[PDB]
Design a protein around this ligand. Structure first.
Ligand code: HEM
Ligand code: HEM
Lengths: 108, 108
């Protein structure tokens, strides 16, 4: 079932992680995708200059994730999302996307 | 309840990830710890010179994880694990441990 993971790694103004994280309590339709299995939003411990928040998403296939990226619900979730280069008031400093095959999983 | 994540990031000789990942199909007792919630073992996509394998573990608390680190089941799991510096035949070149608070999670 859980075969592919996509991560968005966000670099944020120090101290703004809690505010960004609370936004994830509200669904925007990712849950409607048959291929979507789950998500974790993490804050990296022991960071000096910036906060780091990772959004980890777990999928039945790479295709489920690639379709999501192109979907209306992805657009809806990210409609009002701006990075500092687009809106100076945004705490989002940098973003990188990393993808993975999940070779083994076990949820207790 | 998934409040803490610990990651072991392994840098491996290119082409050896499959062999290493298969080892994780065998449990060594981590599942017996109340504070353990689950694990994923991933291979990073698009890596050029080395394979990258991550072991992600999800816990009810940091204490659950640090207790496991010094536990007998940790030793049982890692008893016959060697890196290249200890045994040149090992494809395990380097390791880094990263820890995280989990601020939000949802499994569909
Ligand atoms: C690349 C630049 C990105 C930025 C700056 C960003 C930031 C954000 C923010 C702030 C939210 C919360 C929206 C709100 O409720 O106000 C959100 C939603 C979300 N993001 Fe992104 N994100 C990016 C791309 C990605 C990627 C590649 C993934 C794939 C893992 C991802 C995963 C998610 C998920 C799962 C949600 C909630 C979706 C839903 O509930 O329907 N994000 N993103
Ligand atoms: C940093 C040095 C480490 C290396 C080189 C390493 C490598 C390995 C290998 C090769 C195995 C498979 C053993 C087998 O069945 O033959 C294993 C077991 C495992 N490793 Fe590690 N590991 C390290 C530390 C960690 C850390 C910090 C974590 C925490 C996320 C972790 C998570 C796990 C888990 C959950 C298992 C299976 C435990 C069980 O089933 O009881 N490892 N490790």
């Amino acid at each position: 079932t859980m075969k592919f993971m996509a991560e968005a790694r966000l670099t944020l103004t120090k101290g703004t992680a809690k505010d960004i994280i609370e936004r994830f309590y509200t669904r925007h339709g990712i849950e409607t995708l048959e291929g979507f299995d789950g998500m974790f939003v993490t804050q990296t411990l022991e960071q000096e200059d910036f906060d780091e928040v990772k959004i980890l998403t777990v999928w039945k296939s790479k295709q489920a994730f690639t379709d999501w990226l192109k979907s209306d619900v992805f657009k809806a979730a990210h409609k009002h999302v701006r990075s500092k280069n687009e809106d100076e008031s945004s705490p989002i400093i940098n973003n990188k996307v990393i993808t993975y095959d999940i070779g083994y999983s076990y949820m207790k």
